[PDB]
Homo-oligomer: A and B are copies of this chain.
Amino acid sequence: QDVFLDYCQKLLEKFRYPWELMPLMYVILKDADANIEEASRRIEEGQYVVNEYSRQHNL
């Protein structure tokens, strides 16, 4: 549990998120079975999809 929250903080820091988003890092990493690489890839996919939805809709 303690180590898991350590990975959560690593993920948080990689993406320059504030501590208030630790709950979201918890969910994403738990969903990915504590696979930090896969969690990172997933966040990058979200960032892409959101960015392009915005660009392709005048945002």
Chain A residues near B (Cβ < 8 Å) = 1, 5, 8, 21-28, 30-32, 42-43, 45-47, 49-50, 53
Copies per complex?
2
30 examples of A-B residue contacts, CB within 8 angstroms: A1-B49, A1-B53, A5-B49, A5-B50, A8-B50, A21-B21, A21-B24, A22-B50, A23-B43, A23-B46, A23-B47, A23-B49, A23-B50, A24-B28, A24-B43, A24-B46, A25-B46, A26-B45, A26-B49, A26-B50, A27-B28, A27-B42, A27-B43, A27-B45, A27-B46, A28-B28, A30-B42, A30-B46, A31-B31, A31-B32
CA distance A8 to B49 in the complex (A): 12
